[PDB]
Amino acid sequence: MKFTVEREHLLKPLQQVSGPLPILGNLLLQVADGTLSLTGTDLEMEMVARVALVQPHEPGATTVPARKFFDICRGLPEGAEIAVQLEGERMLVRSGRSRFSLSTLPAADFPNLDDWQSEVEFTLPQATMKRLIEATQFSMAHQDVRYYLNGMLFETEGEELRTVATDGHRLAVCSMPIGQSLPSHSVIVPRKGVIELMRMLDGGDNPLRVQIGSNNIRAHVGDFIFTSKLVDGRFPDYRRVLPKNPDKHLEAGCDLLKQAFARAAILSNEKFRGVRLYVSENQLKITANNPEQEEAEEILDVTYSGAEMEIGFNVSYVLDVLNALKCENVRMMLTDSVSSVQIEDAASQSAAYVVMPMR
Amino acid sequence: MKFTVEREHLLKPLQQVSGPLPTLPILGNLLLQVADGTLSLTGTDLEMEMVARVALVQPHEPGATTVPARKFFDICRGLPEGAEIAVQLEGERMLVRSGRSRFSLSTLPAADFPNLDDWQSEVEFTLPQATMKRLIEATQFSMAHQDVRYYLNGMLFETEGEELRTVATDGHRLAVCSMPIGQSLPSHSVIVPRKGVIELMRMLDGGDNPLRVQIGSNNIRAHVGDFIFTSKLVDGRFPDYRRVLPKNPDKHLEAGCDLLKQAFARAAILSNEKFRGVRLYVSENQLKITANNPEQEEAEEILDVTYSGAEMEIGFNVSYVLDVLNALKCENVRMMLTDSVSSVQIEDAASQSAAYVVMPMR
Numbered sequence A: 001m002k003f004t005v006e007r008e009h010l011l012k013p014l015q016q017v018s019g020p021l022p023i024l025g026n027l028l029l030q031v032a033d034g035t036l037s038l039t040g041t042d043l044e045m046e047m048v049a050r051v052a053l054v055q056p057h058e059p060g061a062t063t064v065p066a067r068k069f070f071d072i073c074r075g076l077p078e079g080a081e082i083a084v085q086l087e088g089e090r091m092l093v094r095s096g097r098s099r100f101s102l103s104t105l106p107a108a109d110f111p112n113l114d115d116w117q118s119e120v121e122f123t124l125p126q127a128t129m130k131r132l133i134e135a136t137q138f139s140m141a142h143q144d145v146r147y148y149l150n151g152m153l154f155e156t157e158g159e160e161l162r163t164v165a166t167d168g169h170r171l172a173v174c175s176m177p178i179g180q181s182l183p184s185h186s187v188i189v190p191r192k193g194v195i196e197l198m199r200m201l202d203g204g205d206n207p208l209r210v211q212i213g214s215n216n217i218r219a220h221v222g223d224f225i226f227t228s229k230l231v232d233g234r235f236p237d238y239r240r241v242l243p244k245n246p247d248k249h250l251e252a253g254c255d256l257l258k259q260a261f262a263r264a265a266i267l268s269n270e271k272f273r274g275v276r277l278y279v280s281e282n283q284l285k286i287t288a289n290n291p292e293q294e295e296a297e298e299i300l301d302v303t304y305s306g307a308e309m310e311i312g313f314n315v316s317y318v319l320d321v322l323n324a325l326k327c328e329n330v331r332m333m334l335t336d337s338v339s340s341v342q343i344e345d346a347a348s349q350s351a352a353y354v355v356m357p358m359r
Numbered sequence B: 001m002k003f004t005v006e007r008e009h010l011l012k013p014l015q016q017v018s019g020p021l022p023t024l025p026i027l028g029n030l031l032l033q034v035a036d037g038t039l040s041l042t043g044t045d046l047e048m049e050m051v052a053r054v055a056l057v058q059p060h061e062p063g064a065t066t067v068p069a070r071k072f073f074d075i076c077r078g079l080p081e082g083a084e085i086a087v088q089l090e091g092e093r094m095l096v097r098s099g100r101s102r103f104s105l106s107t108l109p110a111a112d113f114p115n116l117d118d119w120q121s122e123v124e125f126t127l128p129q130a131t132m133k134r135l136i137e138a139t140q141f142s143m144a145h146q147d148v149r150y151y152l153n154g155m156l157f158e159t160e161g162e163e164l165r166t167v168a169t170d171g172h173r174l175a176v177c178s179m180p181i182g183q184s185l186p187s188h189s190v191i192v193p194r195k196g197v198i199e200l201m202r203m204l205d206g207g208d209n210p211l212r213v214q215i216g217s218n219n220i221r222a223h224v225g226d227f228i229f230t231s232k233l234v235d236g237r238f239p240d241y242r243r244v245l246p247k248n249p250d251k252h253l254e255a256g257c258d259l260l261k262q263a264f265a266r267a268a269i270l271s272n273e274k275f276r277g278v279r280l281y282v283s284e285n286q287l288k289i290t291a292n293n294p295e296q297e298e299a300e301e302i303l304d305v306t307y308s309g310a311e312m313e314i315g316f317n318v319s320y321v322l323d324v325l326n327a328l329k330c331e332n333v334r335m336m337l338t339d340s341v342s343s344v345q346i347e348d349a350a351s352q353s354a355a356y357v358v359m360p361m362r
């Protein structure tokens, strides 16, 4: 295996394949068909990047330490050409009068996701996928014993792709049109897979091809291909989580609401930050207190219809939703003091959030 | 005690005075004092204190109390830009009001707030903010961090004649910087605790107004604008820095700072993860840097330099070298060598104002 390539053409590939990250700490390099392919994996998912080779090259494959190789390439000057030469247990890297010998492990030892079969496929702009994940990812569970919640549901229905995330306490759901009729289908992508996928997608106008199998998902954009195993469990139905008949409706400025929550939380319990909402005619009062008997109170002029009520919320859950919305006005749909609330952008129905009350 | 102040007149002062801030509750509090048209805020960790004075243009009433620094700061920061922040002491609570935002904070008496003892200045001088910033940035990275030799966990400040000098060492590497001040000073040598050095550094906003320094036998004070920093000194005798400088480092090497920095940075990748050793081979107009690790991996960098001394091989901890090159921030570097078992002295090729001594490694 031998190739020469511009540093500039390796930089983004190396960045992408380095997260998922003993051979799991290595990158797989393969020269074939005038292409350098770089692969990183953690056994559950894999990222592949391809780079065209113009300069003379020789086919072959090896694995090298990812961080060492990345740091070498990044550390070379802008404009550097990088020559690579496999020599048994070492891979030689040369650029100008900078020379490196890295230890190798065999390509044959590198874990390979087993072959699988695609069952549903579609293309959508990477920007749409990014929107769907950003709208919902914060509501995924982290290391719950309900293993099926440590990830995100991807659902196709009609002409929409929908994402759902929940940790049992709050839920986020977002649906986007993709311009083609799809079979009805749902799979759970593991949370680390979601985060890696999210990081693969930049700001560009770029078609993203998605292929979903029984046990795997794959996304292809430009010269990158991401593949993850799926989570094999039964995900809750968001339709049954949405409040069925809220009779109380609050509307307020997103940022005013956000800043009022954030201030009141200062004097909530540091270990478990919650605030009390008192809603009445045209007014919202948010209060907090802590074991030192310190107290905060915020009064806001708001749009409100319904009976007077008091209800508590975990601050981080509400702030997470308001931060995700990034909009002018927010709507809160309430039922009673012991039932979850729905929160949406007043000007958009593409996402919705359900939050259980606290206390 | 009552005052009302515009949010942004409180914020920077609150941020500054919270610098030294845990162990007991009152040490997590700021002292607030209204007297003679001024709100004074003070934070302390018992070794040092930072004081801010904020002018009061709105009606106020005199008095003092202490309140939790983090909570009070976060409240002020979280209020909208231009918010008027009204404060009223009410015994065991201090009330804060802005618009229809209301907060009650638990207080501890001003009379219980720890007070750095009174002391007398022995030397005083004024200097540009930028000169003090230069002196500290040039040397601060060479201070020890929690070394059992307490005298190294700090920075020597030395006045003599028309010069102020800083020195820092951790026993393995040393930094010294000297700047003219245009006033003749008595000979004084003091050790400023590392936390105080960092606070002093962070109080320099890099604007026009000068810094006024006062030094006693056991204290140091710096006044800039409406901030006053005071610290106790490390009661210790700093080792004689002058005799750690190589006595005749005749082999001089010159090369581009960034050229060197990047080559060492790349070589470091394949250096021992714990010991970080690199090898320098100097020969006529050439520097070869090598690294290898226990796994038998190897890096080599060859650089064109100016060098006409004898060939020699010497090893260094690459982090110590990179620290120096990063501090220098200059076009060219001069390295002054003796032999394979003696320290190197490194300087900006353009100036002797800062010098760096790094011991070799086996």
Ligand SMILES: O=C1Nc2ccc(Cl)cc2C1=O
Pocket (backbone or CB within 6 Å): A166, A167, A168, A169, A170, A171, A236, A241, A340, A354, A355, A356
């Ligand atoms: O299984 C679930 N039931 C729920 C009720 C309310 C919210 Cl916010 C989430 C969930 C679940 O995940």
Ligand SMILES: [Ca+2]
Pocket (backbone or CB within 6 Å): A006, A079, A080, A081
């Ligand atoms: Ca080039």
Ligand SMILES: [Ca+2]
Pocket (backbone or CB within 6 Å): A026, A063, A064, A065, A103, A104, A105
């Ligand atoms: Ca290897």
Ligand SMILES: [Ca+2]
Pocket (backbone or CB within 6 Å): A089, A103, A104, A105, A106
């Ligand atoms: Ca090997």
Ligand SMILES: [Ca+2]
Pocket (backbone or CB within 6 Å): A207, A208, A209, A220, A221, A222
């Ligand atoms: Ca594609």
Ligand SMILES: [Cl-]
Pocket (backbone or CB within 6 Å): A009, A050, A051, A052
């Ligand atoms: Cl390419």
